[PDB]
Design a protein around this motif. Structure first.
Motif, short mmCIF file in Angstrom:
data_model
loop_
_atom_site.label_atom_id
_atom_site.label_comp_id
_atom_site.label_asym_id
_atom_site.label_seq_id
_atom_site.Cartn_x
_atom_site.Cartn_y
_atom_site.Cartn_z
N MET A 1 122.34 57.61 38.42
CA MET A 1 121.07 57.44 37.73
C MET A 1 120.02 56.91 38.70
N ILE A 2 120.40 55.89 39.46
CA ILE A 2 119.52 55.30 40.45
C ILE A 2 119.17 56.34 41.51
N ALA A 3 120.18 57.07 41.99
CA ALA A 3 119.91 58.02 43.06
C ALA A 3 118.95 59.10 42.58
N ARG A 4 119.15 59.55 41.35
CA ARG A 4 118.28 60.60 40.77
C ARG A 4 116.83 60.11 40.65
N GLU A 5 116.67 58.90 40.16
CA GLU A 5 115.34 58.32 40.02
C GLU A 5 114.64 58.23 41.38
N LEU A 6 115.38 57.82 42.41
CA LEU A 6 114.81 57.73 43.75
C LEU A 6 114.44 59.11 44.29
N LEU A 7 115.36 60.06 44.14
CA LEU A 7 115.09 61.42 44.61
C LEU A 7 113.89 62.01 43.92
N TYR A 8 113.71 61.69 42.65
CA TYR A 8 112.63 62.30 41.90
C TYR A 8 111.30 61.65 42.25
N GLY A 9 111.29 60.31 42.28
CA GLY A 9 110.03 59.59 42.40
C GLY A 9 109.91 58.40 43.31
N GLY A 10 110.95 58.13 44.08
CA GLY A 10 110.90 57.07 45.06
C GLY A 10 110.85 55.69 44.45
N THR A 11 111.23 55.59 43.18
CA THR A 11 111.36 54.29 42.52
C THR A 11 112.57 54.38 41.61
N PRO B 1 106.59 53.01 45.80
CA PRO B 1 107.81 53.79 46.01
C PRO B 1 108.24 53.77 47.45
N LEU B 2 109.50 54.14 47.63
CA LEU B 2 110.13 54.32 48.93
C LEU B 2 110.16 55.79 49.22
N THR B 3 109.36 56.20 50.19
CA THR B 3 109.03 57.61 50.25
C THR B 3 110.01 58.46 51.06
N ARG B 4 110.81 57.83 51.88
CA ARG B 4 111.75 58.53 52.72
C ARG B 4 113.19 58.40 52.21
N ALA C 1 94.64 62.71 45.25
CA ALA C 1 95.17 63.13 43.97
C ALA C 1 96.50 63.85 44.16
N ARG C 2 96.56 64.69 45.19
CA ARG C 2 97.79 65.45 45.48
C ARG C 2 98.95 64.51 45.83
N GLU C 3 98.68 63.53 46.66
CA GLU C 3 99.69 62.57 47.05
C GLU C 3 100.23 61.82 45.82
N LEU C 4 99.33 61.44 44.91
CA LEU C 4 99.74 60.75 43.69
C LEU C 4 100.57 61.66 42.79
N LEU C 5 100.09 62.88 42.60
CA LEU C 5 100.82 63.84 41.77
C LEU C 5 102.20 64.10 42.33
N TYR C 6 102.32 64.13 43.64
CA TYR C 6 103.59 64.48 44.24
C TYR C 6 104.55 63.30 44.17
N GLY C 7 104.06 62.12 44.54
CA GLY C 7 104.94 60.97 44.72
C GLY C 7 104.55 59.62 44.21
N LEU D 1 103.07 54.45 41.37
CA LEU D 1 102.47 54.45 40.04
C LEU D 1 102.99 55.67 39.33
N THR D 2 103.82 55.44 38.33
CA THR D 2 104.65 56.54 37.88
C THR D 2 104.02 57.41 36.80
N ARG D 3 102.99 56.92 36.15
CA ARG D 3 102.34 57.64 35.09
C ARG D 3 100.99 58.22 35.53
#
Ligand SMILES: [Cl-]
Ligand SMILES: [Cl-]
Lengths: 106, 106
Positions: free
Chosen positions: B9-19, A34-37, A11-17, B35-37
């Motif tokens: 915009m793209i960079a911000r989206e990636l920094l925030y959520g990796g997508t 997502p691309l995590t790095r 749940a933590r991993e999902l909430l974070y990223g 999974l963004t939601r």
């Protein structure tokens, strides 16, 4: 361990990223980016927008520290850097710096 | 607009959520579920761990507000809720509450 603990980890991993390496491991099989790095994120951004990203690394120094430069094409080039205990860490730090610059975090 | 703006915009989206939905739109074609939601995140967690998640919604009230309950199986059941201007918003708020509880944010 216990799966109340596993549930919290997922749940933590999902909430974070919005991804869960723990869930992925559970679900994974040997049969069948997502691309995590930051490095991955920047590679993707560059691919869409078209600029070139490349790294230059110096050999590990006498204190076992790595140092890298990153170049992101433009005029002039954006050049940043990262340090760390391995090269990939240097890359992620350097890429993060570039992402933050491109994000216009004024 | 300009693509310095698009790049930010793209960079911000990636920094925030990796997508990056913006990059996805750029790359998308008509030819050819991170999974963004919170609702999606919780659906995934439940699928791996096996508990059942379901929502109950009340009809929009006289002030145009929706209210939903969420049930996440266990003994007793975890029941939370969400309110909002549409049902999906209620769901995401309710699912977020459940994710935070399961994360043991003590
Ligand atoms: Cl890379
Ligand atoms: Cl859902």
């Amino acid at each position: 361990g216990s799966k109340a603990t596993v549930t919290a980890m997922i749940a933590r991993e999902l909430l974070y990223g919005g991804t869960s390496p723990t869930a992925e491991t559970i679900l994974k099989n040997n049969i069948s980016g997502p691309l995590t790095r930051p490095s991955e994120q920047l590679d993707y951004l560059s691919r869409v927008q078209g600029f070139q990203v490349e790294y230059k690394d110096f050999p590990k120094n006498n204190k076992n520290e790595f140092v890298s430069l990153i170049n992101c094409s433009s005029q002039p080039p954006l050049i940043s850097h990262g340090i760390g205990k391995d090269v990939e860490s240097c890359h992620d730090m350097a890429a993060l710096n570039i992402l933050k610059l491109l994000s216009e975090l004024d």
